[PDB]
């Protein structure tokens with residue numbers, strides 16, 4: 001049959017999944033940065 | 046037709062993986078938020 | 091009903107996301123780095 | 136067929152690349168989980 | 181308008197970028213491990 005339609009469904013799914021990754025990574029950095037600033041004021045240090 | 050069958054395979058294979066990367070990062074941020082909470086409550090600071 | 095233009099769009103939408111995923115990973119690496127250093131000069135260690 | 140064979144070559148590469156990222160990532164979570172437990176199981180806190 | 185040439189340029193860019201992400205990742209793993217080890221040999225805990 002014609003697989004173009006199928007090939008397009010995969011990319012859209014890819015871009016979808018890729019969007020969650022950008023958000024998760026987006027949030028992860030803020031935590032890491034927050035982690036750095038917290039460990040930056042940690043007294044024992 | 047063409048290499049659609051082949052090219053389609055790579056894509057499905059690319060998603061399967063990304064789907065996994067997503068979940069990995071997904072859980073990772075959970076392990077990074079706990080770590081963040083732990084340092085915050087760490088009396089050593 | 092040629093899906094080329096549409097397909098071509100998802101691609102451009104993927105790279106845009108990657109471009110952003112990449113930039114985020116650069117800053118994250120730079121942040122973690124700074125955090126590894128801080129932990130090293132940590133007295134109580 | 137045209138640039139098809141060459142596009143398939145890129146897809147196969149992107150796919151091999153994801154694998155690597157996937158793996159490197161599956162390792163980060165261990166390094167991070169572990170790290171999490173240790174920080175948690177710290178007496179100085 | 182034959183869009184094959186352009187999609188080929190996109191795929192290639194998808195691999196160029198992925199190589200960055202893959203390259204930036206493995207370095208970060210190194211830092212995360214370096215971080216870990218430091219914590220482990222940290223007295224206070």
Ligand SMILES: CCCCCCCC/C=C/CCCCCCCC(=O)O
Pocket residue numbers: 011014018021025028056059063066070073104108111115146149153156160163194198201205208
């Ligand atoms: C032909 C379709 C294009 C291929 C789709 C795949 C897109 C590339 C995906 C990149 C994965 C990036 C993952 C980065 C996660 C890093 C997480 C971390 O370091 O904490």
